[PDB]
Design a protein around this nucleic acid. Structure first.
Lengths: 57, 56
RNA sequence: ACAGAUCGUGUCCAUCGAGAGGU
DNA sequence: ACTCTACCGATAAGCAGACATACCTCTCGATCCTGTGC
């Protein structure tokens, strides 16, 4: 036997998926947040990774 | 450059105002018309200009 | 002459700061 | 020959400017009024 504990991090509270959801006002870009059906951010690092891959389209 | 950027154009004599899309209205919880800081600054500039014109 | 109640579709509650987090 | 003082270059030393990995999650507050009116 060994003592084990359950942490506050569950997969049910972390799974997210967006496909043309709610829209912002100022920047007209997808909103942020799982609670308000947000979209993941394509950061700069992913941009240079795609550039190095050569996938321009 | 004599065509695109003259030296005398660095002095502000006619300040354009951004359109409402640049400075939208924040709806905010409960029916209150919260406004952007740019609108308040533009109103302040207009008030200062009117005061200067009247004082002159 | 003509000269309407709503109906039918309806868009969200935002911003600024502070704290706690986890790879 | 270098005194009476001027611009040339070559530094010392203080005055400010810009900025700090990336990803997302959650909660919690605040967004005005006091002197002045008849």
């Amino acid at each position: 036997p060994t003592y084990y504990q359950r942490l506050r991090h569950m997969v049910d509270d972390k799974i997210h998926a967006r496909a043309r959801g709610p829209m912002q006002v100022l920047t007209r870009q997808p909103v942020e947040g799982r609670s308000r059906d947000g979209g993941l951010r394509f950061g700069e690092m992913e941009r240079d990774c795609m550039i190095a891959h050569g996938a321009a389209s | 450059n004599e065509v695109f950027s003259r030296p005398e154009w660095m002095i502000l004599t006619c300040l354009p105002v951004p359109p409402p899309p640049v400075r939208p209205s924040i709806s905010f919880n409960e029916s209150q018309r919260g406004e952007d800081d740019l609108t308040f600054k533009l109103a302040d500039i207009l008030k200062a200009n009117i005061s200067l014109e009247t004082l002159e």
